């Protein structure tokens, strides 16, 4: 109800610098930044830099005043290219006869964007920490080698726009895919 | 830096939308709630509908209770060179003449422009220019004086020295 600041107190040093200060709860000020607006006539400008110092928090600032009269005082409050997180890919698993992995991605209307794919297959009796981590520069299918003819194995994939002019975080992993023999 | 702008980190698919998520502390929510603001241009801003969430995978904070959300905003254009509770307040009409707190007097060695050492200040001895009957000899007495404005001239006195 009353998270507002109180005790808006100001004083003039008697030279060319007014200085004001106010208290505010430490909980509300943690969510919202505030600044001291001043009007030398009834322009509006703000002071900087403001100081700060248990349940309450006192903020103070020194405003230069070269002169004036009645003052109006008040307290008031991302690049796309480098922040990209593509959606996870749709992953399937096929075997001709040899096993060949296949996945699809949301169509980027700027087709020329190179897609960096990181994949990994796992032996069910092992950790992803120590798993084959193969990389690929743009594709939508990868051929796997031969393996143990009776063991169960998992598979996972993630995409990144690891370009040059671009940047961002990887995509969330796909729903893990499994197979055996 | 406040926690919402510190916890907020927007990413995108660069084709259809932007998915932002942030958080507000539970201690503040009891006081006042906050909303995410998205500006369209210099003159006109625009609000955005948001909702709660269970996790928080993009940012972090050493707080006890947090309220993570998930805001989704759509877009039909993306290029490299793109970059993006209820009324509170208080006012005061402060004339500089009546709100004047002069400086502390510096180095009785004291446009423009007293008590004993052992004795307490609870009822010390009172005191125009900057310069036995007051003290018994062989007894220390601390120097405590400041610069206050003349009543026949407004505001408050200086700091103690």
């Amino acid at each position, epitope marked *: 109800d009353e998270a507002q600041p109180q005790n808006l107190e100001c004083f003039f040093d008697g030279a060319a610098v007014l200085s004001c200060s106010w208290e505010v709860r430490k909980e509300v000020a943690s969510s919202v930044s505030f600044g001291l607006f001043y009007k030398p006539s009834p322009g509006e400008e703000e002071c900087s830099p403001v100081l700060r110092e248990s349940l309450h928090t006192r903020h103070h600032c020194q405003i230069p005043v070269p002169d004036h009269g009645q003052y109006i005082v008040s307290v008031q409050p991302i690049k796309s290219s480098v922040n990209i997180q593509m959606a996870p890919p749709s992953l399937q698993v096929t075997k001709d006869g040899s096993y060949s992995l296949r996945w699809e991605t949301m169509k980027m209307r*700027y087709e*020329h964007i190179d897609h960096t794919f990181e994949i990994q297959y796992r032996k069910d009796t092992a950790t992803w920490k120590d798993s084959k981590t193969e990389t690929l520069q743009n594709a939508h299918s990868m051929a796997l080698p031969a393996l143990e003819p009776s063991t169960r194995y998992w598979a996972r994939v993630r995409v990144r726009t690891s370009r040059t*002019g671009y940047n961002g975080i990887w995509s969330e992993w796909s729903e893990a895919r499994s197979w055996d023999t | 830096e406040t926690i919402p702008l510190q916890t907020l980190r927007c990413y995108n698919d660069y084709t259809s939308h932007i998915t932002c998520r942030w958080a507000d502390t539970q201690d503040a929510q009891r006081l006042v709630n906050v909303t995410l603001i998205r500006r369209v241009n210099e003159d006109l801003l625009e609000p955005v509908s948001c909702d709660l969430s269970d996790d928080m995978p993009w940012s972090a904070c050493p707080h006890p209770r947090c309220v993570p959300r998930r805001c989704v905003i759509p877009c039909q*254009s993306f*290029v*490299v*060179t793109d970059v993006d509770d209820r009324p509170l307040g208080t006012r005061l009409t402060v004339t500089l003449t009546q709100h004047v707190q002069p400086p502390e007097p510096r180095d009785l060695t004291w446009l423009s422009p007293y008590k004993r050492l052992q004795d307490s200040w609870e009822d010390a001895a009172i005191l125009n220019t900057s310069q036995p009957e007051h003290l018994m000899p062989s007894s220390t007495y601390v120097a405590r004086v400041r610069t206050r404005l003349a009543p026949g001239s407004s505001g408050r006195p200086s700091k103690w020295s």
Partner: antibody
Amino acid sequence: VQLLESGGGLVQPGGSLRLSCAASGFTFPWYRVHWVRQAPGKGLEWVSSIRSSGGFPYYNYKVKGRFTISRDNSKNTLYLQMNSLRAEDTAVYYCARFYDSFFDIWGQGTMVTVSS
Amino acid sequence: DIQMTQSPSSVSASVGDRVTITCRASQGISSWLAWYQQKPGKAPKLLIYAASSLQSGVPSRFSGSGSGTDFTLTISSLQPEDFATYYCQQANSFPITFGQGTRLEIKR
């Protein structure tokens, strides 16, 4: 697959003049288009670029307090309008698509020879 | 507000020769710029995009390169229909600007 433009001609200083462009037979859902300027027998000078919902207008030097971009995603029609005009702008105007970090779709343009 | 300047200011050279041009920017670019060709009267054509990739409908004799601000455009071999004025394309940030406009000739 080639966009075209129209409007603009000889006019005395100060007077206004509308510029009307038009896309044509692309898959356009939905890219941005800029205006650029070619001074007679001289270099190339950029001018403006709106965006989608008429959100962000961008100008340059003189153009500020003169020209005004406008969006028209409706029937695919980027238009331009300038009021005060002088022989700093006595040039021809090219319409150009802005395929991400570069242009690709270009127009023939129109001459705007300001003079009385 | 972003100073884009290309050099040399003019370059004549015979046919079947190696050629070079360079863009210099005032601030950083990372890799956001492009390369345009302009025959007179006709509209400018996109020569090379992303500062290091050729557009469709353009031969491979052209070559782009560079990052940060020291960018280039080299031609490994020249033909007589390569007579035109060449321009730089900002892209890193607004306000978007171009090079001074280089013009080449042919040692006939």
